[model samples]
Target chain A: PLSRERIVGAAVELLDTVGERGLTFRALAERLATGPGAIYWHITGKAELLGAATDAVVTAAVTAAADSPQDAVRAVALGLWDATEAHPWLATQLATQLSRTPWGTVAPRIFESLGRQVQAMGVPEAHWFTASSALMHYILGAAGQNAANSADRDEFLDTVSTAWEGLDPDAYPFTRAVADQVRGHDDREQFLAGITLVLTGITALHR
Target chain B: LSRERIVGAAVELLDTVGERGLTFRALAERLATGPGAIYWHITGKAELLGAATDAVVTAAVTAGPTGAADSPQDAVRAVALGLWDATEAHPWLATQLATQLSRTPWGTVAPRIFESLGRQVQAMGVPEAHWFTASSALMHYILGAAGQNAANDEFLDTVSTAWEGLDPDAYPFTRAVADQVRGHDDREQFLAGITLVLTGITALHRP
Candidate 1:
């Protein structure tokens, strides 16, 4: 109520309850039992507010300790991943915002954690930026896409197959042929599969 | 002036300010006309987005790497790299790609990229049942992975310095890895990240 932390807390809670569209200053003000102007004193515009909330969620995830350096990286990545699932808006924010402001938002925190793992894995210093970056992009790309998704993994794959299978027979044979394959899958595992695979390539370079 | 010209200008605007910065109003101003004229050529934001994605996706899919027969591996790599490079050039393209890629239209570029790449995955001999997720994994991998251009690295320094200031107790892993990212090549590292993810995809094939 009196504090920025309280205002942001209310904003996060507001986001969870109403999604991004509903998180207007009026909404935050009502939730915080204060004037809209009061909230602005702590943060300006929707972008900064959203960024702060995202920072909090990502920070919460990154704060947890991990097993190995690799484990730490996975944990941080998935931590962001998992938080996004709980807050799909967060996923969209991660997808759109992280790319624009890689330093100030949740992304740098993520970069720091993931880069550490690539370092631990012993990727040569020359390869370090790419190692973490590729992973960051993959995570953000999937996160944004994941945020955009509307169903569970099974339903999502099922829907994808249904759409692809329904494609015009002549024009989409390849997609049709593989439509069935797109169905019947898990969400998170499907997401991270590429990231995990890419890590092996990085791992090959690890020595 | 023209739809092509409009799209080209949009691409330029996107690279300069990214997705949120792009609007029909702005596009018209940049084109030195009113928004209504642009609308006559391009319906709305969605179609403009479709056009933009088409611009990038067409080039990306067609610009496949030249190689021998049965180089689905190379083909996938080629497709991913092309798209990655395209997104890197016009980051606005990256924002729209995930939306277009998953929707899987039979119309033009997006589905075609998936299908061509799908054909390659098919050739890669993923058992039919696994085709959907596997190719999707590649899609997500490309979608999820790294980006932008050389001119942007000027700001990454802040990203590094910010990390150096994190609380070690909370970010021991993030702190430990800062040295790896301090001064690495942006584009080379990006390609390496793509290779890592692609390597991850290839690993999925081994028994």
Candidate 2:
């Protein structure tokens, strides 16, 4: 939406609403308020457009402004978690971000963000990669699946917890039991709780 | 090709070329059959993918190491890890598992996981109401990572290298942790991550 050359920017916005398949040149051109040929001038193909979408938003979410390595890890993890929550399609792009060539774009920004925190937290040299990658995988994984589901943060917490209350009690004894807590909290908080668990294990690797 | 053979080859093609290459023509060509013959057993794109994914997940569900006599904690760990490894072996399974288990029309995919994990959560003496919460969290966490790993496989190596040489000022923790990720043990990280989730659910149970 910025100017003629910012096809990638509008592509992300287009994708954020629509999804991989919905991102046509016409849609992007309209979003950018330009012509399809103008859109074509800056973009090459749909596959490249998908990769560029990740090239935009995820890099923004990867910035660090927290205190310690651990704090920074949570800060950045929550940052991306929130991003995926806001634009769940970014979660889909997050996967495509991995499979695309140049491998050095959005994922590295996050890994380095997380990886450095793992290292800075005093995880031994031998375990730093394991620690950071674990956290990365957990965060990315949650986002990926959350993105896969059509629910947003609002609908997810609301309907999902309620949906569970209706499950067959005998078949889902454990699932039925947890609906209270499940319904009571935010999806992001629960994800954070799991990250805290992963964080707890990362601490074991420290010193 | 028969349904079984066709499904197997579909899995292979999906892994090799991704969703784009998964066409009926491609399947028929790969299987040495006509399009008519192909549709004779499988209905269309969705069913073929359904059958293909079912074959992968069905095999994964049945193939894991089940430590029935193990502690509830250990039992869930083995369950989560087996699925994790199986998804890793078939990157497509990671995406398939996330989307299929979350929203797949098939009853087989999601419940198979929830039932196993839910039973263990019950054995762990969770209050009946919280069973769904715990199992749901575990399922989300596992599938989250699986989908992420599948996405990461292509670029992870290059991303690791990029991590090694990131701008130090920008990525203090990330840069410092570089070598660790470059030479890290994937299985170790996967196990540790499971530990964290287990620890989280452990806290959830006690709380």
Candidate 3:
């Protein structure tokens, strides 16, 4: 008795708990208290199910207020980031989709939002496309990195800390000091800082 | 009679292949030697083997010019990028390391490079630990993104071509314009995106 919405909801829950790898039709069926065949009645297969699941995840986060084009664009970018953070699976899924050429399902929304942002920023018509393209790549690039980091939080910290210990002040003096600064800190803040940097870079082109 | 040279050769092979799914016995056999002998020279089984593998890989990419740069920060940053390019194993290694920490061997080299970059930038009068932190995040972020992209190269190419053929009039404002630029170039375009963003962010940090 699982509806399409229910199937997607179940899949979303599974994704958050176990990630893209753990999501299987049988597992989803179990989560729905239904048979595997019943689950198939709603979704064609894993790819279709994931596509729906990803779309839901994106739509939820990318829903900025329909105000000016500029605000909407910024909202979309921030929304994508927020969604990626909320569902770490989003990054891997995006990466897979990006690789797979499933443009009809994914790229339009992202590109549209990005183009609107650039256009609103007063980028010339000729340059808006390239500017927005760079911005989109930068955002997608950052989000994918952030999601991977979120998935492996503790190990990343340990690796960085160990590297800090091995630094020789005489040979790599500056690296040693900077390594010390990052010894204990917030990762989300780091993500925001990097994103802000990219945005800053984009804005700098205007001035 | 497996010496460090044999281990070094095995590690070199792994740069093209990978660890875990790969095997020491297969590596030994590849050398036309006995597995038992290789085991005697190595310490513990898996951990030591992985460590040696990672060490060799790290050593392979560690030799950059030691001469300090006019702006040590830029030099360090360039070195970090260089290291990332050299490792080219895909984002999965970094992702695995970040998540499991102990899984990948390059964590030491990665953070060491980060530390060096931070110090060089900091010496340039960049105040606050945030600068170093941001740089660390940026390096990992760039690597993770590129790794994922590299892993899915064929798919990305197909998608890029499809996007190029899209109806220009319908989605005239598509960020696809940047796609043409990317099409003509290669990884350099991706690298430039990261560099531009990082440089822009660093410039903004100045008082």
Candidate 4:
């Protein structure tokens, strides 16, 4: 039976297939073997649909079980990284939605999961907002960029590394010095390393 | 008059209107010229947007407290605040930066911030090998935190109340942290995150 869940599920698939611009009620309705009017009966418009789609993916991604607070943080960060990797459009959508209406459903879902662990980590109440915000920002930012790079990974990294190395030595000394590090870098490990960095900060600053 | 003038006008248009409102026609009209004249200086909106992003970012990252800085940490905070303030004034920039940096990872915009921040990571007395990871963690956190802060200031109360109202069983942590979101200082929260990442860098890479 056609339901909100069914429509949103199909919207997620269509979003995965075609991205934000190509996602339309007419197309989504067609995919669901129904009419646009029927789809609208469930979702009012594209904005709501995008929000629902984002929430659906995030809800699934943030569910993780870990033994320690640090592990829980790592699990949540990796789950988001994997989700953005799978749904290439999600990275941009997340930025747009969170910036546009953070009080909306999606932000809280992500914040709660991370904040719970931040609390479990024994971070002082005063630092929970800063601690969670730091983790959330890093996870979303790195995950989004990593997903954007999922295409032609080795080629892209080598190209960027070479470009950095070739930059004017005087103008970009730091980038030039670090160019080699860009190549042969493992994305997942780098991401986890960042999570560890932020966790270390949380423990050191707030605990 | 020149590419500089065209980009300056484009930035003004973006600031006054928004990303969607930026068009060669509007920009041409604002410049007292035609679209083709604008195109002569730049390829199209993609290049125009990139140029505008680079212009603002270069100015922001360059205008840091390099001269008056006391320590690497202070300089990092200054550079981060520059980017954060730029996004607040030009809301379009937040999302544009994410898209621009991710799409063209080696673009001029990426290096401006990366180089600025990487130099500080080096100055913190960290060894050469961990430069890339440490620098990346800072850059990612800055961009992510800055991007999300663009449109969130005005809605904090509404969002906080909404979060507080969430089912306690499902969102205990977020509900508890709701009050912190209200009347919280954005720049302070941002700097705190930077401190966390910095502390992590210190702890993880200590010699």
Candidate 2 RMSD to the correct structure? 5.4
Ranking by lDDT: 4, 1, 2, 3
Which candidate model has the greater lDDT, 2 or 4?
Answer: 4
lDDT comparing candidate 4 with the true structure? 0.81
Q: Order the candidate numbers by TM-score, best to worst.
A: 4, 3, 1, 2
lDDT of each: 0.69, 0.68, 0.61, 0.81
Ordered from best to worst DockQ, the candidate numbers read 4, 1, 2, 3
Best by DockQ: 4
lDDT of 3 by residue, A1-207 (tens): 778789999999999998788898677888999876545557886887787888888887887344765456557767887888889888777766655644546676577667767666666665564556556665675566566556545555556656665767787665565554554656556656665666666565673
Tens digits of per-residue lDDT for model 4 on A16-114?
Answer: 888888897677878889765545567776888899998899878767353898988787888889889888888878877776765578888888878
Question: What's the TM-score of each model vs. the native?
Answer: 0.74, 0.72, 0.76, 0.88
Compared with the true structure, what per-residue lDDT tens digits does model 2 show for residues B29-112? 888877765556787676667677767766766676666578888878777777877777877776666656455534356655
Model 2 chain B poorest ten-residue lDDT run = B99-108
Isolated chain A TM-score, each model: 0.81, 0.78, 0.79, 0.90
Give the per-residue lDDT digits (tens) of candidate 1, residues A75-169. 77788777777777787666556445645657656766687788788988766667777777767667667676642546656766676788887
Error of 4 at A45 (Å): 4.9
Candidate 2 lDDT over A76-190, as tens digits, reads 8777876787777777667666556544467667766677667667878766666666787778777666666644445455565576667788876755566555546655666
lDDT score, residue A48, model 3? 72
Give the distance in Å from residue A193's predicted Cα in candidate 1 to where it truly belongs.
2.8
